[PDB]
Structure 1
Amino acid sequence: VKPIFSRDMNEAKRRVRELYRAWYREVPNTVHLFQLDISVKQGRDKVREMFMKNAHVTDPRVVDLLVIKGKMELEETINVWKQRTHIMRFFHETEAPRPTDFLSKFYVGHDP
């Protein structure tokens, strides 16, 4: 199969690290640009969290596309194409926390 950008997982990890550096350095500016109420640590924590969410991937092709999507979000963030709400959408705030305990779910509703 034709690789999207990276032939091997090591090459893909190189792209992932490059994207992580750009996001890590952009977070301070992003807080300034959109006048966000999150701290620079909070934004960088979210960046790491988002990267760690897709940490189970093993296919270099999928990792490549994930990096491409990550780049696209960074491009919009850097170019101020996103708005303040768009950046805050990463930080789910209004959404009420849904519990994980079975007994709590049992009380909450018929949630499977």
Structure 2
Amino acid sequence: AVQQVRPILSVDREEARKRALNLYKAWYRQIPYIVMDYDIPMTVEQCRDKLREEFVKHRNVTDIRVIDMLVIKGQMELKESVEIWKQKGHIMRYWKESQDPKPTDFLSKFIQGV
């Protein structure tokens, strides 16, 4: 159940958690520049709450290569957010705008057919 692979961007889970904390620190420092340089309705506190929500969404993972993959894609999205290549519509894709909240109860899904 154990294989030897080539590590990507980490050699231990504490190092991977430390680099994820580097990613969170740089994202937290880049929040008020994102609110200032984009014409978005979301404020600084809402952006920080969304950043915390996207980190605790990926809280559940355990594997070193998977969490390093997540850190790499997060740093790429951050580099697309420091240099302004994303638009105001790309920034507001984290908040699910223009989407009706689907119900969770069985009765409303039964009436709506979902």
TM-score range, shorter chain: over 0.9
What root-mean-square deviation, in Å, do the aligned CA atoms of Structure 1 and Structure 2 show?
0.9
- AA aligned to 1:10 is E
Instruction: Show the counterpart of 2:101.
Output: 97
Aligned position for 1:66: 70
Higher mean C-alpha displacement, 38-47 vs 97-106: 97-106
Match of 2:91 in 1: 87
Match of 1:49 in 2: 53
Give the C-alpha shift of residue 28 in structure 1.
Answer: 0.7
Matching residue of 2:19: 15
SS of residue paired to 1:89: coil
Distance in 1 between residues matched to 2:12 and 2:67, nearest whole Å: 10
Listed as ranges, the gaps of 5+ residues in structure 1 are: none
Give deviations 1:37-66, integer Å, cap 9, x for gaps: 111010011111111111111101000010
Q: Distance in 2 between matches of 1:12 and 1:102?
A: 41
TM-score by length of 1: 0.94
Amino acid at match of 2:35: V
In the superposition, the TM-score normalised over structure 2's length comes to: 0.92
- 1:35 is displaced (CA, Å) by 2.5
Cα deviation 1:60-110 (Å, max 9, x = unaligned)? 10000100000000000110010010001111111100111122211221x
